[model samples]
Target chain A: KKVAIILANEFEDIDYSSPKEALENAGFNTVVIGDTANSEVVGKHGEKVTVDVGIAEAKPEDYDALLIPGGFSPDHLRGDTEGRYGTFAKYFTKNDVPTFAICHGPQILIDTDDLKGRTLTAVLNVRKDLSNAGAHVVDESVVVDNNIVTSRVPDDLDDFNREIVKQLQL
Target chain B: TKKVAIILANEFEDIDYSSPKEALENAGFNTVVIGDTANSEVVGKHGEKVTVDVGIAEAKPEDYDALLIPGGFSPDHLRGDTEGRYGTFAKYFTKNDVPTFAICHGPQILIDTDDLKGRTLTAVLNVRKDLSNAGAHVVDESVVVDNNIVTSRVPDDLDDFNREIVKQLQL
Candidate 1:
């Protein structure tokens, strides 16, 4: 199965690396998608990533699941008042295809207009925004709200990736 | 009358800037908008327009009695400058013990200040760990005050943020 990992510069390094390693070890194919194709995105800790596909060319139909890491990446992605990232994110949620978000990753989902009535968890600062958007927010190491999987912070990575592997298997 | 330096850029959380700005101005405090460029306009996420009054290069921490950092994408944008202009400006407030108010992503900029060590504060949950890593004692609360610095979690806590800011500026 293929997964789309959406992100931008200033992402949390472990947030992306931990999941990518898990999914790759589980034999899943992952593609790094960002604002521009062939561009480099740097993590907050200085890890560098080159985009495999730009949002402009990425087709939602090509992927089986979605992953969004945290840090300021989501903030940058959601800044598109033009709704490019929102439209892309909506595809995964609308299809309910194992959408995994961690830390500030779920902040972009707010633009998807998909949080209303969904039960989920995210980093604390983003929880209130989720609740304000009509989500039932919770505090947990990992939250499986339908196909939308979420975890709070880097400490929850073990639980988070384990859950993702479990969900993708199912 | 004291001046408050508001450092922000495009896509700031609307109410986070507006509510506190309103409260500060109503309290007879003059507010100066600081950005990357002087005279450029910065828009909030919800469509509020704020014209920049001073560029980070021109802003003097000594001239302003206090600092305000509103959340949203603005803090990240300001921190994006490779020159670290905003960080240097922010450091002035911390080192000099100026009243500093930061909400939500506001504290994100403080990460660049390298002065968060041992400070007690609250911020958007996503940034709590970052603050903790920076040596701050992060708390979950509507408002947290440690000496001259005040922080709140989100826009929902703007009332508490504004009230405390107004109270602090008075002293």
Candidate 2:
């Protein structure tokens, strides 16, 4: 199965690496796509990583799984009037593909209304937001409710990796 | 006196420590910031340093009503310390069934204490194996409250974590 990881400006570096490496090791075709063509994005910590494709050139149907890496960048993406991030998140959830989010990553899911009745977690402070969106917020590191997988932060990366691998295998 | 102790160390996340501290204080709990050393200032992962109120050596689990370990790379260092102070502090709640809470890597401290054995809990996703090794039954949820121990996945779940702590402390 192939996985499409959506990377954007100021993505969280750790959020991109652990899952990308884990999925790749599991023999899945993973593609890193960004918002702009041939553009290099800097991580939240100012670390830079190059993208393989741009959202304009890619479609959700091109991959079996969709992973959203959270940072301040993804927040900007949700504001896209064309509904790029929200659409991507909705496509994956609606298709039953393993949709994973971490930290601010869940914000996109929340924005898309994909988290209703789904138990999930993120970087601690978003409980009210998730609750407001009709999500059953839990305190666990990584929350997997059906096709959606979410984690709190980098600290939860270990469990996040395990859950994602498990979901992919299913 | 109702006192809550927070473990402080280098690379600790500032928001993780301060926000919880602020929440607890707002709820009328007296907070004590405890560090590894008496004179040491703990620097956050974001490069901010916070002066601690007490050292692990001078702190006793019995002096506080609850314990909160905010996650960061700090727990990685604290977990490696074989001295009983950190370990003892973590085990206090499990042993006495007192209110204890950990977030993100903070649960690593609980795992280090071996108190998580068979405890249903949640933490930052990366520490799942460690949680399992510590005898916890890891689940995919935001916060896991097994008896007196409470945990959440990350900063985003702070509201739930705080609510649980307030409830537990009242018990």
Write model 1 residue lDDT over A50-80, tens digit each, in one string: 9999898999989989999998798777655
- Model 1 interface CAPRI class: incorrect
DockQ, candidate 2, vs. native dimer:
0.03
Q: What is the TM-score of chain B in candidate 1?
A: 0.98
The candidate that achieves the highest TM-score relative to the unseen native structure: 1
lDDT at residue A108 of model 1 (Cα atoms): 78
Poorly placed runs, candidate 2 (over 4 Å): A1-170, B82-84
Q: Candidate 1 local accuracy as lDDT?
A: 0.87
- lDDT of residue A140 for candidate 1: 97
- Output the worst ten-in-a-row residue range by lDDT, candidate 1 chain A: A124-133
